[PDB]
Design a protein around this ligand. Structure first.
Ligand SMILES: CN(C)c1ccc(C(=O)NC[C@H]2N[C@H](CO)[C@@H](O)[C@@H]2O)cc1
Ligand code: NA
Length: 434
């Protein structure tokens, strides 16, 4: 597997949440999420990553006019993450194109929404709005499948350029997820993904690279089908940056039976297997790129939920993938219920992990009171390997075999270690002090 890297050349293992669904329809475009909420998340789970929802409607409220005050608000939030050592992926988020389709959809500004008078009648489930005539036409106009709106993708790319211009020198921002859950309207499958989808990604990457050379550009397959374990027809995107390509692949995982026991468990288990095979293939097509599982999630009060969650994180670990759980929002899907009570997610996610490794992590494992990590060394890296250790399992000092302890911060829960770079692969084992 390939990894995103920090400025010290360390390989990043990314663990966190999508924050937050509540932003989708917020008038000011911000999630209902405070600095105190992040402090709680960090204290309870030691996360180091966020997929932070932004929106085109908030960036570009009028054609060619970008809202710098909105970007100020996003910058303020990124600051909260920066202060607690997080890396941030900005997600240009949409579901069902736009709020202007009827509160149901979100993403595009009203000026960018052309349903051409075609109907969008009320449906019993939100997902069904995707296939209503007016929504299908909004998407068809966006992709210029209709031939009537070539400007829309160009506007999209330049709104991204505006965002990248603001965040190019932000040390907490590591990735730009170019489009949440792409949907092709009347185009579906490889016709969509290798056609207008790939074309938009190339134009947007190119525009971003006018103002930002170093942030990872993250691309997704179409959501419908591929979310459920079908192959993607997405094709390679060219990164014009001088040096090595910085493109990453950011698919989602949503097995059909969950939308976890008996035949339903078997179906979900083979879905993961299929999803892994397909994800690995497309990551190869894109240039042996790093993988971020940008969304997965379920109602944690469902029987078998913990087994499913643990299986997904083990699979991500084996794949060398980042994870942003959908989502931090209050409710039984999330880490907290609305009254602040912890769900099953907190104890499940609160495990030791390597955050930033001085070399390529070839294999690792962790339990409540043990972490083991094997590193393929890189002599050029001078920064230590940085590891999260939860207090429940590590209430005092650490015992470390295979590395020298550089620092052990019992407040931030960050252990830093140093390993030789001239003795082949090194295995570090961390346990609680006697
Ligand atoms: C019919 N189409 C095109 C469709 C249907 C359903 C989803 C979906 O459930 N996606 C999973 C989650 N992703 C969003 C956030 O990106 C969440 O609201 C969904 O639960 C996607 C597309
Ligand atoms: Na950055």
């Amino acid at each position: 597997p390939s990894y995103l890297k920090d400025d010290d050349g360390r390989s990043l293992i990314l663990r966190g949440f999508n924050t937050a669904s509540s932003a989708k329809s917020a008038p000011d475009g911000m999630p209902q999420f405070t600095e105190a909420d992040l402090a709680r998340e960090y204290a309870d789970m030691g996360t180091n990553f966020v997929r932070f929802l932004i929106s085109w409607r908030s960036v570009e409220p009028a054609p060619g006019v970008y809202d710098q005050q909105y970007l100020d608000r996003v910058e303020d939030r990124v600051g909260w993450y920066a202060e607690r050592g997080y890396k941030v992926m900005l997600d240009m988020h949409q579901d069902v194109y736009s709020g202007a389709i009827t509160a149901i959809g979100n993403g595009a500004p009203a000026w960018a929404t052309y349903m051409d008078g075609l109907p969008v009648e009320p449906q019993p489930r939100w997902e069904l709005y995707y296939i209503q005539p007016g929504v299908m036409r909004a998407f068809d106009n966006f992709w210029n499948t209709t031939g009537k709106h070539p400007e829309l993708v160009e506007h999209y790319a330049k709104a991204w350029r505006a965002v990248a211009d603001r965040f190019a020198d932000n040390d907490a921002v590591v990735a730009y997820d170019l489009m949440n859950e792409p949907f092709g309207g009347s185009l579906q499958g490889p016709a969509f993904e290798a056609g207008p989808l790939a074309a938009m990604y190339q134009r947007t990457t190119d525009a971003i690279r006018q103002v930002d050379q170093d942030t990872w550009v993250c691309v997704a397959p179409q959501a419908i089908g591929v979310n459920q374990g079908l192959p993607s027809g997405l094709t390679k995107i060219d990164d014009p940056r001088a040096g090595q390509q910085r493109i990453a692949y950011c698919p989602h995982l949503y097995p059909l039976p969950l939308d976890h026991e008996g035949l339903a468990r078997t179906l979900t288990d083979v879905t993961i297997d299929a999803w892994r095979a397909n994800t690995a293939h497309t990551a190869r097509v894109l240039g042996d790129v790093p993988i971020i599982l940008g969304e997965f999630g379920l109602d944690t009060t469902l029987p078998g939920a913990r087994d499913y969650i643990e299986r997904v994180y083990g699979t991500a670990r084996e794949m060398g993938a980042g994870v942003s759980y959908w989502s931090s929002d209050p409710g039984p899907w999330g880490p907290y219920l609305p009254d602040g009570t912890q769900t099953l997610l907190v104890d499940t996610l609160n495990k030791p992990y390597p955050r930033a490794v001085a070399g390529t992590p070839t294999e690792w494992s962790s339990t409540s009171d043990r972490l083991q990590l094997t590193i393929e060394p890189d002599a050029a890296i001078t920064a230590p390997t940085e590891i999260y250790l939860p207090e429940a399992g590590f209430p005092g000092d650490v015992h470390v075999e295979g590395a020298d302890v550089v620092g052990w911060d019992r407040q931030s829960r960050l252990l830093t270690v140093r390993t030789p770079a001239d003795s082949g692969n090194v295995t570090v084992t961390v346990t609680p002090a006697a």
